[PDB]
Ligand binder design. Structure first.
Ligand code: HEM
Ligand code: HEM
Ligand SMILES: [C-]#N
Ligand SMILES: [C-]#N
Lengths: 306, 306
């Protein structure tokens, strides 16, 4: 019932396409073609899944709050959805776009095939793509900081449904709030740091990702910043982030998170970027966000009924 | 034994690193460090192969004619090796570099790990990288023209040794001449051509890559330009080219060929670029080379004995 990028784990490749919708709100014939291209996407996802089961293909199309009422008059807007540009007073790199297409695979050839076919269907007259990122998993699932990324990511269908998807019975059930943020790593600055500095920064050990005990790690460590609770409930999210970039050029992390509630993501951003207690995540001394957007990925039914 | 990028077929990923050596001919300490890093490269290739046999990993380090005497006083220079910049009067995009590192894999994570570890070993104090390309195989091994690439590539160890490696008993036996050339495709010019025009351009059928008879295709079809013989012997080469690039940006073919004789490659370039009969390859109406370099990949024994 959900789109197919939230529940599956450990994809090896991901393609991220973000951009703006060039169709006008009154252009009903253009919007009808746009919605037929959406149906073509869901149909091609299904076909690749049957032809290439080893790809474990997944895909989602997601919409911003500013474009929501252009694309639909039938589906009510998700209650928390807003522009990420409202965070620009304290978080750098905000760049709210209309539309995200996120495709995951264990093979680049099928990842690329779906992305290419989809972009050819929509075309330049419907989508103005601002960013196209080819993400790939590294050996031992390490981020380019060379720490393992994913240790405390929710595991399994039950937990990823609980934390990643709007609850059954709620408006927009089985959709998901989405946050994307491209980071550029300063590895010339990070590589020379002593191991104790690197482990203080992240809050886990480098080799095995063992948690540093709370009383020995700084309150500004990354895991101290992002492991948050409210009323005894953990504000967990489902991350699908992947490394990207050139060894000899610009590189970093293509961050993406799916969540049952946008609040779970936004409170972590307030924590990392100094809005909760005045203090910033230590990781931000070594990496910089240069894009950012909020979206909602509808359930499969609501996607097809926009 | 050869380096390990010539004989294996059908790699799914390739990383191409081309650039210039920053070590002076008079720096014996720097040259000894450089050669220790070459040794580390060959040791890591062997280690990845034992740990990840499913990667089918391969790698080669290759040297230009300009840099040959800087890196060795012991191995004689290959008899045909020269700078590709000597073709600049008729072939666009020439950009001769000192060094090529070519790594191939069936998994991007191990391809990238070897490429990144190698670049960190050499460092920016030894190598100035001018181009880093991440190539990937597409579905059905099709070039971005959507024709299958590789149908007449020599198959199996026997033929790829014969055409890809210097013959046993010759100077530099089991090394290979190498040519790299990055193409940028103009798919907006190509896609609207009818199938009849596309098949005339390549010289094979699109769906099944069946050869169109020589008397029914233009002399400037790509197959007529490149299927060459002299004195009854075919001028075959071993191609390892891969697509690369962004769907919404610059994309094309990262061409690379290995040959037992540089003449086999250069005669095909003269053919394609109008130097033999004044006529250009039809494929060049739709794609443009923007880089180019000639190198020699020594045998594994001459590589370690530089
Ligand atoms: C440069 C960007 C980032 C890097 C390199 C990075 C890396 C990591 C690493 C290495 C871990 C520890 C292993 C794990 O449990 O996954 C981690 C944990 C985590 N990260 Fe990030 N991260 C980044 C940005 C973000 C952002 C922007 C958020 C939130 C919006 C976030 C949320 C989390 C969460 C929730 C955890 C798990 C914390 C826990 O409960 O223990 N990260 N990150
Ligand atoms: C944009 C660049 C290029 C594209 C898209 C391209 C594509 C192709 C295709 C589709 C084929 C037919 C299938 C096959 O037998 O592999 C082919 C054959 C071939 N290509 Fe290219 N090619 C390109 C550049 C080059 C260059 C620069 C050379 C030589 C230096 C070359 C040498 C060959 C050879 C030798 C064959 C096999 C011909 C035969 O014996 O039948 N190609 N190419
Ligand atoms: C953290 N992705
Ligand atoms: C032709 N590669």
């Amino acid at each position: 019932m959900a789109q197919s990028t939230v529940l599956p784990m450990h994809c090896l490749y991901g393609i991220f396409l973000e951009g703006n919708l060039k169709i006008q709100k009154n252009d009903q014939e253009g919007l009808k073609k746009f919605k037929d291209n959406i149906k073509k996407f869901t149909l091609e996802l299904d076909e690749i899944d049957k032809i290439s089961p080893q790809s474990r293909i997944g895909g989602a199309i997601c919409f911003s709050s500013d474009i929501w009422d252009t694309v639909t008059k039938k589906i009510s807007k998700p209650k928390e959805l807003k522009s990420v540009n409202t965070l620009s007073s304290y978080m750098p790199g905000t760049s709210q776009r209309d539309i995200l297409i996120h495709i995951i695979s264990d093979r680049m050839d099928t990842c690329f095939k779906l992305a290419q076919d989809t972009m050819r269907n929509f075309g330049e007259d419907q989508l103005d793509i601002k960013q196209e990122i080819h993400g790939f998993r590294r050996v031992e699932e390490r981020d380019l900081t060379d720490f393992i990324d994913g240790t405390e990511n929710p595991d399994g269908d039950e937990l990823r449904t609980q934390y990643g998807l709007v609850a059954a019975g709620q408006p927009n059930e089985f959709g998901s709030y989405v946050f994307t943020q491209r980071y550029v790593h300063n590895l010339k600055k990070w590589y020379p740091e002593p191991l104790s500095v690197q482990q203080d920064t992240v809050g886990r050990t480098k080799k095995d990702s063992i948690e540093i005990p709370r009383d020995k790690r700084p309150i500004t460590s990354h895991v101290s910043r992002t492991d948050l609770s409210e009323n005894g409930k953990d504000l967990k999210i489902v991350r699908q982030s992947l490394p990207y970039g050139q060894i000899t050029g610009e590189k970093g992390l293509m961050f993406i998170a799916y969540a049952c509630s946008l609040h779970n993501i936004e409170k972590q951003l307030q924590s990392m970027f100094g809005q909760l207690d005045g203090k910033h995540d230590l990781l931000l001394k070594y990496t910089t966000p240069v894009t950012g957007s909020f979206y909602f990925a509808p359930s499969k039914k609501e996607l097809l009924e926009l």
